[PDB]
Amino acid sequence: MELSFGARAELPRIHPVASKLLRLMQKKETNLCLSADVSLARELLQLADALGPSICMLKTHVDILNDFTLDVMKELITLAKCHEFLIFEDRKFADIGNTVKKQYEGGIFKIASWADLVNAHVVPGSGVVKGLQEVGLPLHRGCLLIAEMSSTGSLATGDYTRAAVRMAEEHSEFVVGFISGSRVSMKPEFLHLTPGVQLEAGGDNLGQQYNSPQEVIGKRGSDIIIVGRGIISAADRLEAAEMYRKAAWEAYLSRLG
Amino acid sequence: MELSFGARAELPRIHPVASKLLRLMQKKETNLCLSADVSLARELLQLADALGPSICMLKTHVDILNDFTLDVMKELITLAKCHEFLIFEDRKFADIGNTVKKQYEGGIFKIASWADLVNAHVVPGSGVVKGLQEVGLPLHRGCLLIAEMSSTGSLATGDYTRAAVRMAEEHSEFVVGFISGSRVSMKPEFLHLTPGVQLEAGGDNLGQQYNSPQEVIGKRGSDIIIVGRGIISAADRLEAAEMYRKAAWEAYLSRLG
């Protein structure tokens, strides 16, 4: 039974951050997450402001921003609130629980302070979730687990993927979904976000593989497309965002009915 | 056919960074890596200077330093050059090649500018290495691949571990060894570094598991112990560093002859 995003936002077991996301996706007719892979704060903020109305989420790698400051993140939060999107830091935590707690809370980035969502690899065991959870829980944050990767040679397959799904189910108080190439859980309260998405066929020279919105959302049953270069490399990033938005939304509509 | 660290440093296929590390290990009679998990630059620099004579390597998590600057790294390098230890940033890269490249060279940390060694998870496939290599090779750096983890429920086992070893052998121009719990390659050009080490049996509250230096170096055939809290939490950190050094060094001597 396929439910709309709006309905899924009202599921009994839904995390408040997931419900906030699903509600705005429904309101704005977007299941597009912009992967804002830029190195300048000015470009990041200009993108967030211009594309804000077209996206449900903005994915960051703050560790590549050459002029990061917490004030940059303050201005980002302002735009997120104004245009209604969540902020997802793609930190891909992959260390023991005691370490990731500090990497999430502390340092120069203070990620937990501005990021609605973060994600984690499951290779260290559930301790990685337990550690992030100690920080994220009171702050009403959520976490995505990396069940599959988009890159050539990915070891996130078979039993590895299954362990990711189990770990998510076992920590549903904080884990709100997956980074994956397709649906991996049948529980509707879990979000599926998919990177490796472009309108055109291809990859890059460093192992990335691309599939289309239609394939990923329609055929593979994912919820949200994550798109970097497909948008960022366009001359007009707003036009490109709209293109990806309409693709992903219609693919979702067709799956519904 | 086991060779001393001094002999391994001279092997024809040895990477320069590994050779430099092996020679100072022999000179100083230390196969101890200090895990300097502190949140203040002052404390990082203090520990590095005080414990420098006892260690072959200092392992950092620069993303937990509340007051990182590149000047703090310039100074760390001064101490490293004075006391003769390498700097290892335990960044645990786990993203696609295109992204890790920028995370290694760029952002606020400029890791590649100051870290002799970094490490990477193998889960994304070999693109994670090819990306890092593009930055590391020009800068004369080395990389360790994460073949096994110390934590409860680690998925870095069996075929995953084998994939890590193959990935290393196929990228021997940049990969100089492994993060592992035991010897996983029979090639003497590769280093093995093992975290999860304490004199006493135990673990932490978030999935860390500990084995002793004698078990890890002696029985399991690893080269270098990585120790954080075992030293930092002791009342006398110098005496603590010396106990771990002497344990690890004696275990190496006994295995050798």
Ligand SMILES: *c1cc(=O)[nH]c(=O)n1[C@@H]1O[C@H](COP(=O)(O)O)[C@@H](O)[C@H]1O
């Ligand atoms: C994360 C996990 C994964 O499996 N694949 C990925 O590509 N990523 C991150 O998503 C973004 C893809 O951007 P693009 O290829 O559309 O430009 C990127 O930031 C990568 O780190």
Ligand SMILES: *c1cc(=O)[nH]c(=O)n1[C@@H]1O[C@H](COP(=O)(O)O)[C@@H](O)[C@H]1O
């Ligand atoms: C990295 C990989 C691994 O498998 N296990 C690890 O513990 N780590 C890192 O090593 C350090 C262990 O420190 P301690 O438990 O001796 O204090 C820590 O920095 C962890 O991130």
